[PDB]
Write a protein that binds this ligand. Structure first.
Ligand SMILES: *[C@@H]1O[C@H](CO)[C@@H](O[C@@H]2O[C@H](CO)[C@@H](O)[C@H](O)[C@H]2NC(C)=O)[C@H](O)[C@H]1NC(C)=O
Ligand SMILES: *[C@@H]1O[C@H](CO)[C@@H](O[C@@H]2O[C@H](CO)[C@@H](O)[C@H](O)[C@H]2NC(C)=O)[C@H](O)[C@H]1NC(C)=O
Ligand SMILES: *[C@@H]1O[C@H](CO)[C@@H](O[C@@H]2O[C@H](CO)[C@@H](O)[C@H](O)[C@H]2NC(C)=O)[C@H](O)[C@H]1NC(C)=O
Ligand SMILES: *[C@@H]1O[C@H](CO)[C@@H](O[C@@H]2O[C@H](CO)[C@@H](O)[C@H](O)[C@H]2NC(C)=O)[C@H](O)[C@H]1NC(C)=O
Ligand SMILES: *[C@@H]1O[C@H](CO)[C@@H](O[C@@H]2O[C@H](CO)[C@@H](O)[C@H](O)[C@H]2NC(C)=O)[C@H](O)[C@H]1NC(C)=O
Ligand SMILES: CC(=O)N[C@@H]1[C@@H](O)[C@H](O)[C@@H](CO)O[C@H]1O
Ligand SMILES: CC(=O)N[C@@H]1[C@@H](O)[C@H](O)[C@@H](CO)O[C@H]1O
Ligand SMILES: CC(=O)N[C@@H]1[C@@H](O)[C@H](O)[C@@H](CO)O[C@H]1O
Ligand SMILES: CC(=O)N[C@@H]1[C@@H](O)[C@H](O)[C@@H](CO)O[C@H]1O
Ligand SMILES: *[C@@H]1O[C@H](CO)[C@@H](O)[C@H](O)[C@H]1NC(C)=O
Ligand SMILES: *[C@@H]1O[C@H](CO)[C@@H](O)[C@H](O)[C@H]1NC(C)=O
Ligand SMILES: *[C@@H]1O[C@H](CO)[C@@H](O)[C@H](O)[C@H]1NC(C)=O
Ligand SMILES: *[C@@H]1O[C@H](CO)[C@@H](O)[C@H](O)[C@H]1NC(C)=O
Ligand SMILES: *[C@@H]1O[C@H](CO)[C@@H](O)[C@H](O)[C@H]1NC(C)=O
Lengths: 117, 416, 49, 49, 49, 146
């Protein structure tokens, strides 16, 4: 960012300060707020397993068998190839299920068995 | 130009492609109530618990809207069990779907018209947008399957397993569905394809010219922005406290008076979230009621030929093609419109033997000198025969009957 | 009646509502369904029935 | 000191007040041309007067 | 709080009127501009017009 | 404030249930009391009939549908030539098993012989794309000559 020589702070459209000029070094730092989000718990029924996978919504996994996804950071579930139907929804095309020696898996879901007519 | 004996019949038609746009989901959202009201303050959280369940009663509600927006998008688009595909060959009788079928070269496989639609439509205070369960890539794969099923197999993929048909015969069943005889297509097939392909052209230029056409979709995005911008600006309001800034009440006063200055800010920021959640719950119901209509048009319009007047565009409905948009769907309804009418004299019935004759499928007309029977929605005059007419009664019982020769095709054939 | 309260008028006043119902009714009687689909096509009312 | 609530309440009631003219327009204005009946009421015996 | 009550009531009411104007616009499209094969939609009986 | 909240949640809920009771009334009027041509409105398939059953605070429709369940590939043509004039199927489509031509109803394979009673005519074969050549049997020809 290039502030004018007398501007000391920089503001987002929401009137929230998003940059500042270091008063001992006339150059501008971005402020990015400290990372937060929902902690979501993914489970098959307790009539099936007491395994849980945890999704930390909209974090890079750095701030927390660990997967970066467009929904957030998914932990305790293993990424896989085979595209299944959705079982538990997760976001951004990802779903999770409990599958075979059985663990929670995470995958981009299949829409349906393809058919050139 | 009404009279007791005049009818106008169309001598030509125009295949027209109309655009109809519906919103289908909101921006999903969860707000952490406690962080919105009392962000980075345990001293404020200690007071927020005096109000009990309101904090969760609001999170549950916003969860209800967010979980529903993926039901709305599933109901509209996931109306198919199989990802139907077209062949690499494009022998659709002359019908040029290239502008609405996928472009495989782009990293999301949307159509050309879907890129026009995506181009025309556009914080850390507990506020968090959640991604949709279906990415615009998977929404675009469902609309491609619905469209490749429609083109290769007519309505049949909605009823059961897809049963292929030639597209020039599918359009003959369509034409038959609007009460127009199958030969009106096969004799005009290269005209009807050029009318159709011209109409698909006009739609691109209409979409390219302005953003106002997607106004329904843009308004849904605009209202979620206005209600988040308003929810955020209400953090800065005093509500009758000495300040809005929570750390400044937690330093310019001691606890016994800070508790009342904070209850001012909690009572205002809680009235601010109860207002936002109420506005959103009503708004979300306005979009559920639109997603249920888009689902209904996708079933009755795309997956079939609707007979419901003006439900599937102006004119007699032939077929329609679903295209995605950000938070919405677009239907391209193809409709037959009767274009160029001529007046004829007409009569309800005719006399040939004192018994009265009536048209099986159509109406009696005369050019002035000769009487004919023609299909009701297109001028194509048959000479009047015992093959084209049925009988009842006698010529005294009907008001407005006229006399004319009926050809019996069996007479020459018996004499020969 | 003065505490900010106002009733804005409708955009279509009831004469203009009644011209549309006249047009819809006159179209229905003199041309069957054909005025809904395209340019209207006259038919004798007993043939429409 | 209550901030936006006033502006928001005026907007919400404006949003309703505009919508009442969308409703009336979409019900009645389903017709491009104002069709009219002839003076000769020969409707096959049906009396729409 | 007495305006946030009234505007909540009016937003909930206006969506119920919206839902009825959408029915009335659909009846005018399918029932008046056409003939409805949908049973009991356009009054009990076989619908003519 | 806890009542005005509950009563607001309830007024929005009752609007969500009113919108469903108006769908249930429509499904009962249109496809219990009738047969519905609307696609997927009353079950997947082509609609035959439905049977209303009650449930606590609701209704359950048992929609009975015709699902086409086996199929065969045929060759087909939009029309056929015979006397140079072009013949089209009255109800149905033309099909061939690979050696003979038939006319059959579109939604179920039951073939008929091609006849001047199962077809109608317009124009000539120079106007129509994809037309084929086959006999059309006129049931009058034997009935005159015998
Ligand atoms: C379908 O329409 C597209 C254009 O909308 C055709 O593709 C164009 O073909 C012309 C030659 O006629 C080329 O000059 C253009 O560069 C092509 N444009 C694009 C974007 O491909 C296509 O050939 C048409 N197909 C049929 C069967 O008519
Ligand atoms: C009304 O229709 C008849 C039948 O088409 C017209 O008479 C035919 O006219 C053509 C030329 O267009 C001649 O080749 C035929 O020999 C005529 N056939 C018969 C059986 O007369 C007639 O001219 C038309 N009348 C009007 C008022 O246009
Ligand atoms: C249609 O033509 C027939 C003739 O084929 C008319 O019948 C005649 O009517 C007159 C009285 O108007 C009698 O004098 C004749 O004896 C009748 N002849 C026959 C064969 O019936 C009939 O009236 C005409 N109808 C119309 C509506 O013009
Ligand atoms: C249509 O029917 C109405 C009756 O419902 C007719 O009105 C009557 O008209 C006669 C004269 O024709 C008067 O004697 C009566 O006093 C009228 N009654 C009423 C209630 O107005 C009307 O005139 C008929 N119109 C046509 C064109 O036949
Ligand atoms: C196509 O269908 C026709 C009619 O069913 C078949 O021809 C008949 O075959 C039987 C022997 O299996 C003969 O007895 C009949 O006389 C035939 N009828 C005619 C009109 O020729 C024909 O064999 C079928 N083709 C195939 C490829 O199975
Ligand atoms: C519907 C269902 O899944 N029921 C099962 C039941 O059969 C089983 O005995 C029980 C064990 O705790 O868990 C539950
Ligand atoms: C369990 C396993 O072997 N998974 C691999 C996956 O890691 C790889 O990215 C993919 C490439 O197509 O093939 C599969
Ligand atoms: C299709 C056609 O020619 N329609 C004519 C119309 O133009 C004319 O104004 C009217 C006069 O009564 O007669 C009819
Ligand atoms: C119902 C059926 O058997 N359809 C087949 C199809 O599967 C096959 O790929 C094609 C090959 O030409 O012929 C047809
Ligand atoms: C601020 O002080 C540093 C020394 O610590 C000096 O190098 C720098 O040039 C000074 N900047 C200004 C704007 O006076
Ligand atoms: C943050 O996320 C990006 C992917 O968008 C990734 O490249 C990067 O390595 C992540 N940061 C860390 C420190 O892991
Ligand atoms: C019908 O309209 C087309 C243009 O869409 C025109 O080329 C054609 O000549 C017209 N045909 C008749 C029979 O008027
Ligand atoms: C039809 O209208 C004309 C006047 O245009 C009239 O002379 C004739 O008697 C009427 N016929 C019938 C059966 O209504
Ligand atoms: C149908 O398409 C094929 C190409 O797959 C072509 O060879 C054939 O001549 C076409 N026939 C007609 C009637 O268009």
């Amino acid at each position: 960012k290039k502030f004018l020589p007398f501007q000391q702070f920089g503001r987002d459209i929401a009137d929230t300060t998003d940059a500042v000029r270091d008063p001992q070094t006339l150059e501008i730092l971005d402020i990015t707020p400290c990372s937060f989000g929902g902690v979501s718990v993914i489970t098959p029924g307790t009539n099936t397993s007491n395994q849980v996978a945890v999704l930390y919504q909209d974090v890079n996994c750095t701030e927390v068998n660990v997967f970066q996804t467009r929904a957030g950071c998914l932990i305790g579930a293993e990424h896989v190839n085979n595209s299944y139907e959705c079982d538990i929804p997760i976001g951004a095309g990802i779903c999770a299920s409990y599958q075979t020696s059985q663990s929670i898996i995470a995958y981009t879901m299949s829409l349906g068995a393809e058919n050139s007519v | 130009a009404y009279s007791n004996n005049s009818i106008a019949i169309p001598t030509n038609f125009t295949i027209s492609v109309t655009t109809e746009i519906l919103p289908v989901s909101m921006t999903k959202t969860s707000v952490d109530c406690t962080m919105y009201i009392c962000g980075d303050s345990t001293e404020c959280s200690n007071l927020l618990l005096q109000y009990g369940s309101f904090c969760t009663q609001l999170n549950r509600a916003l969860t209800g809207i967010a979980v529903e927006q993926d039901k709305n998008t599933q109901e509209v688009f996931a109306q198919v069990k199989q990802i139907y595909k077209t062949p690499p060959i494009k022998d659709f009788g002359g019908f040029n779907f290239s502008q609405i079928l996928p472009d495989p070269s782009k990293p999301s496989k949307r159509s050309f018209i879907e890129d026009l639609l995506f181009n025309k439509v556009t914080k850390f205070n507990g506020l968090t947008v959640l991604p949709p369960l279906l990415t615009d890539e998977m929404i675009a794969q469902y609309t491609s399957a619905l469209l490749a099923g429609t083109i290769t197999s007519g309505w049949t993929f909605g009823a059961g397993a897809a049963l292929q048909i030639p597209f020039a015969m599918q359009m003959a069943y369509r034409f038959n569905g609007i009460g127009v005889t199958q030969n009106v297509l096969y004799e005009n097939q290269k005209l009807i394809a050029n009318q159709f392909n011209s109409a698909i052209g006009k739609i691109q230029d209409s979409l390219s010219s302005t953003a106002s056409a997607l106004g329904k979709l843009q308004d849904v995005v605009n209202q979620n922005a206005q209600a988040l911008n308003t929810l955020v600006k209400q953090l800065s309001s005093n509500f009758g406290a000495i300040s809005s800034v929570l750390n400044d009440i937690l330093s310019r006063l001691d606890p016994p008076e800070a508790e009342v200055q904070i209850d001012r800010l909690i009572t205002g920021r809680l009235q601010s979230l109860q207002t936002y959640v109420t506005q959103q719950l009503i708004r979300a119901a306005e979009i559920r009621a639109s997603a249920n209509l888009a689902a209904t048009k996708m079933s009755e319009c795309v997956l079939g030929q609707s007979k419901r007047v003006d439900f599937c565009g102006k004119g007699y409905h032939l077929m329609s093609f679903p295209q995605s948009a950000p938070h919405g769907v677009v239907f391209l309804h193809v409709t037959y419109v009767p274009a160029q009418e001529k007046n004829f004299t007409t009569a309800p019935a005719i006399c040939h033997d004192g018994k009265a004759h009536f048209p099986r499928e159509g109406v009696f007309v005369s050019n002035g000198t000769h009487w004919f029977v023609t299909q009701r929605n297109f001028y194509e005059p048959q000479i009047i025969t015992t093959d084209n007419t049925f009988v009842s009664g006698n010529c005294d019982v009907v008001i407005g009957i006229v006399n004319n020769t009926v050809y019996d095709p069996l007479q020459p054939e018996l004499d020969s």
